[PDB]
Amino acid sequence: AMKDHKFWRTQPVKDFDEKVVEEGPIDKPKTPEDISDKPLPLLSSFEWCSIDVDNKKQLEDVFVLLNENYVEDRDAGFRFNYTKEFFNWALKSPGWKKDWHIGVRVKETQKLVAFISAIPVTLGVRGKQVPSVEINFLCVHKQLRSKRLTPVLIKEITRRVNKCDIWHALYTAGIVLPAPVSTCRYTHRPLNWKKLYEVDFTGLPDGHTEEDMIAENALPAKTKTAGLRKLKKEDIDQVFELFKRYQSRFELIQIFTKEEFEHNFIGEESLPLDKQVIFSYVVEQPDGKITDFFSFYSLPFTILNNTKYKDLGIGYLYYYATDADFQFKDRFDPKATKALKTRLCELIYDACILAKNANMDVFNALTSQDNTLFLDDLKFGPGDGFLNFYLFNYRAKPITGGLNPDNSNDIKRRSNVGVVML
Numbered sequence: 001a002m003k004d005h006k007f008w009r010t011q012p013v014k015d016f017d018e019k020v021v022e023e024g025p026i027d028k029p030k031t032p033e034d035i036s037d038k039p040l041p042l043l044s045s046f047e048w049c050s051i052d053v054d055n056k057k058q059l060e061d062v063f064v065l066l067n068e069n070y071v072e073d074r075d076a077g078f079r080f081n082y083t084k085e086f087f088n089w090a091l092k093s094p095g096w097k098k099d100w101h102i103g104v105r106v107k108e109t110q111k112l113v114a115f116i117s118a119i120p121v122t123l124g125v126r127g128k129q130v131p132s133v134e135i136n137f138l139c140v141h142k143q144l145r146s147k148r149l150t151p152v153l154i155k156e157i158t159r160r161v162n163k164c165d166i167w168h169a170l171y172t173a174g175i176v177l178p179a180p181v182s183t184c185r186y187t188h189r190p191l192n193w194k195k196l197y198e199v200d201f202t203g204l205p206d207g208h209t210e211e212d213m214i215a216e217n218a219l220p221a222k223t224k225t226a227g228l229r230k231l232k233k234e235d236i237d238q239v240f241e242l243f244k245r246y247q248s249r250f251e252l253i254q255i256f257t258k259e260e261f262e263h264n265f266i267g268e269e270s271l272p273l274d275k276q277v278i279f280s281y282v283v284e285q286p287d288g289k290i291t292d293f294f295s296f297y298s299l300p301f302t303i304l305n306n307t308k309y310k311d312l313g314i315g316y317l318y319y320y321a322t323d324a325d326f327q328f329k330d331r332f333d334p335k336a337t338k339a340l341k342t343r344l345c346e347l348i349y350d351a352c353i354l355a356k357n358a359n360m361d362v363f364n365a366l367t368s369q370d371n372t373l374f375l376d377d378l379k380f381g382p383g384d385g386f387l388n389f390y391l392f393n394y395r396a397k398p399i400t401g402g403l404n405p406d407n408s409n410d411i412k413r414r415s416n417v418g419v420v421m422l
C-alpha cells in the first residue's frame with residue numbers, strides 16, 4: 001500500500017523505496033510566525049484539552065483511556081496497565097509542557113476519548129544534530145475508530161510543536177507507513193515460564209513437557225558481574241560520558257543532556273518495588289572507574305478472566321553502554337565484536353536476573369543497538385511483532401535494524417538504531 005494513504009500522502013515524509021541522496025528536512029524552512037496560534041478545528045461535539053500530568057484526575061483519565069483501549073480485541077484477556085508513576089517518568093522529562101500532552105474530550109461529558117503526546121529531544125541522525133520531538137502514546141477510543149481522528153491529532157500536535165520552532169520528529173509504529181528509516185523485531189525472554197504459559201503468553205512446543213521449559217528457562221538467583229550495583233547520582237558524570245561514547249557508534253540516537261540523562265535513569269525516590277519504573281545499573285572497578293551501564297523499565301499488563309493471576313510483569317530492556325570494545329578502532333573488527341559480545345552476554349544475563357528478581361515475568365528486547373550479539377544466546381525468543389522507525393519532515397538513508405531478510409537476527413552487522421522508544 002503506497003497511494004492509499006489519504007493522510008500521509010499529504011505529509012512531509014519519505015516515500016517507500018525512495019533513494020535518498022541528500023539527507024535532511026523535507027519541507028522548505030518555516031518560521032513560528034507562519035504557524036497559526038489557534039488550535040485546529042475539531043468535530044463540533046469535541047474540543048481540545050491540555051493534560052496536566054501534575055493533576056491527579058487528568059493524568060488518571062489518560063492512563064484509564066489507554067488501559068481500556070490500547071489492546072485491539074476484548075477477548076484478549078489482557079490489558080496494558082499504565083500507572084501514574086510510569087507517566088510521571090515518561091512525561092515529565094526536562095523541557096516538557098502540558099501543552100504537548102494533548103487530548104480530545106467530549107464537550108458534553110468531558111470524557112477523554114483521544115490522546116497523543118510530544119516531548120522535546122535532540123536527535124542525532126548520522127552525526128547531524130536535529131532539534132526534534134518524540135511522539136508517543138497516541139490513542140483513540142475504540143468507539144471513535146476508523147473515523148480518521150488520528151490525522152487531526154497528528155496535525156494539531158505538529159502545529160503546537162511548529163509554533164515552538166521545532167520541525168522534526170521520531171515516531172515508531174508496528175504498522176507500515178511511508179518509508180520507515182528502519183525496522184526491528186521484538187523478542188521475549190521468559191523469566192517466569194510457568195506463569196507465562198498459564199496466562200497464555202507462551203506455548204508448549206510438541207515433544208516438550210512443562211518441565212523441559214521451566215528448567216530450560218530457569219535463572220540463577222544472584223548476579224555474576226563483579227562491581228555491578230545500582231546507578232547513583234554520584235555516578236552521573238562518568239556514566240553519561242561512557243554512554244555518549246558508546247552510543248556514538250549508532251546512526252540514530254537521542255542526544256541527551258546530563259539533566260535529561262539523570263531524569264531518565266534515576267527514578268523517583270521512595271517508590272515500592274511493585275511500582276518502580278526505571279531500573280538502572282552500573283559496574284564499578286576497584287579504581288572507581290565505571291565501565292558498564294544497563295537499564296530496563298517496567299510496564300505491566302493486567303490479566304483478565306484468570307483465577308490464579310490478575311497481573312503480568314513485563315520488563316523492557318532499555319539503554320546500556322560498556323567500554324568492552326573501546327580498545328579497538330573499528331566496531332566491526334572481529335576482535336572488537338568478540339570482546340563486546342562476551343561482555344553484553346554477561347551484563348544482560350544479570351539484567352534478566354535483576355528483572356526476574358524484580359518480579360518481571362518476561363523480558364522484552366528489540367534487535368536494535370548491539371542486541372543481536374546476545375539475543376539468541378540469552379534465549380530471547382523471536383516475537384511476532386516488528387517495529388518500524390520513522391522521521392517526520394526528515395529524509396534519511398536506510399539504517400540497519402538488526403534483521404536478516406528472512407527476519408532472523410543479523411548478528412554480524414547488528415543495528416545502527418541507537419534510540420529506544422517507549
Ligand SMILES: CCCCCCCCCCCCCC(=O)SCCNC(=O)CCNC(=O)[C@@H](O)C(C)(C)COP(=O)(O)OP(=O)(O)OC[C@H]1O[C@@H](n2cnc3c(N)ncnc32)[C@H](O)[C@@H]1OP(=O)(O)O
Nearest residue numbers: 005006007008137138139140145146147148149150167168
Ligand atoms: C515536527 C513535529 C511533528 C510531530 C508529529 C509526528 C507525526 C507522527 C505521529 C504519529 C504517532 C505514532 C507514535 C505512537 O504513538 S504508536 C502507538 C499507537 N497506539 C497503539 O497502537 C495502541 C492503540 N491503538 C489505537 O488507538 C489506534 O486505533 C490508533 C489511534 C493508532 C489509530 O486509530 P484509527 O484505527 O481509528 O485510525 P484513524 O481512523 O483515526 O486514522 C487513520 C490514519 O492515521 C494513520 N495511523 C494509524 N495508526 C497510526 C500510528 N500508530 N502512527 C501513525 N499513523 C497512524 C493511518 O495510516 C491513517 O492514515 P492513512 O494511511 O489513511 O494516510
